[PDB]
């Protein structure tokens, strides 16, 4: 198989520096060029750089020239992207990818978050539901940084009707998202509904049981 394993993402302040790695396996990147492509939440793809180690050629996206540097380590079969003078616009998920001759293979992606706000575990607040017909309920995952946080219900026992929404950045600088479930309201009197929340950056794991008014 051909695999590309990325690392070196995470947090850093505006103007700070961060070095990503993309370790190649199954081939030798001297026969290959490796590309880096990023993407901000909900928007399109943007190529940022290219290196052809066997021709010593480098290329950088205009909005990146003079601040990033792409390297390749023969001995370890690893390409790097040394990012510096980082700005709040660089916050994206970065993919390393390999290229009569297309990017056939893509890495896992690694999240990069530039901002002053430091890491913070989420807060969980119940959205209490109203015998009966249809009942709605959820948990508000608020004031956490950086992304991501992932929500499950009854450790995956409840899946039908559940809608976990994308997080949104607030004026504060922290994220918040919602996860809800629509169930029959005849269940609320007896059945328990538990919101499971996971935040590895702060290694927070939480269960919030939600009960009616």
């Amino acid at each position: 198989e051909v695999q590309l394993v990325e690392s070196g993402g995470g947090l850093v302040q505006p103007g700070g520096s961060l070095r990503l790695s993309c370790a190649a396996s199954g081939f030798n990147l001297s026969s290959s060029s490796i590309h880096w492509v990023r993407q901000a939440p909900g928007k399109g793809l943007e190529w940022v750089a290219s290196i052809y180690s066997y021709y010593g050629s480098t290329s950088y996206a205009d909005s990146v020239k003079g601040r990033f540097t792409i390297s390749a380590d023969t001995s370890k079969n690893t390409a790097y992207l040394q990012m510096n003078s980082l700005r709040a616009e660089d916050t994206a998920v970065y993919y390393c990818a390999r290229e009569p001759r297309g990017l056939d293979y893509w890495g896992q992606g690694t999240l990069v978050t530039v901002s002053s706000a430091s890491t913070k575990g989420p807060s969980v607040f119940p959205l209490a539901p109203s015998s009966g017909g249809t009942a709605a309920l959820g948990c508000l995952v608020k004031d956490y940084f950086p992304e991501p946080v992932t929500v499950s219900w009854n450790s995956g026992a409840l899946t039908s009707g559940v809608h976990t929404f994308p997080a949104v950045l607030q004026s504060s600088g922290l994220y918040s998202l919602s996860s809800v479930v629509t169930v029959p309201s005849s269940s609320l009197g007896t059945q328990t509904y538990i919101c499971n929340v996971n935040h590895k950056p702060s290694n927070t794991k939480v269960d919030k049981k939600v009960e009616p008014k």
């Binding site: 890491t119 575990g121 807060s123 702060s202 927070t204 939600v210």
Partner: protein, 57 residues
Amino acid sequence: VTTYKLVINGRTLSGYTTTTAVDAATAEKVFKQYAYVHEVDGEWTYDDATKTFTVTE
């Protein structure tokens, strides 16, 4: 600095969170307000060999 840890076992909330701080006493006020706003009020117990606070109900 180093990182402290709060183990929380209340009626409705159960889990563990973290944060960094210079002294435990500073991570105490952070962990405390976290409890107050989540309506967790119980017996606090600190463990310094593990740097972990514990609120139990």
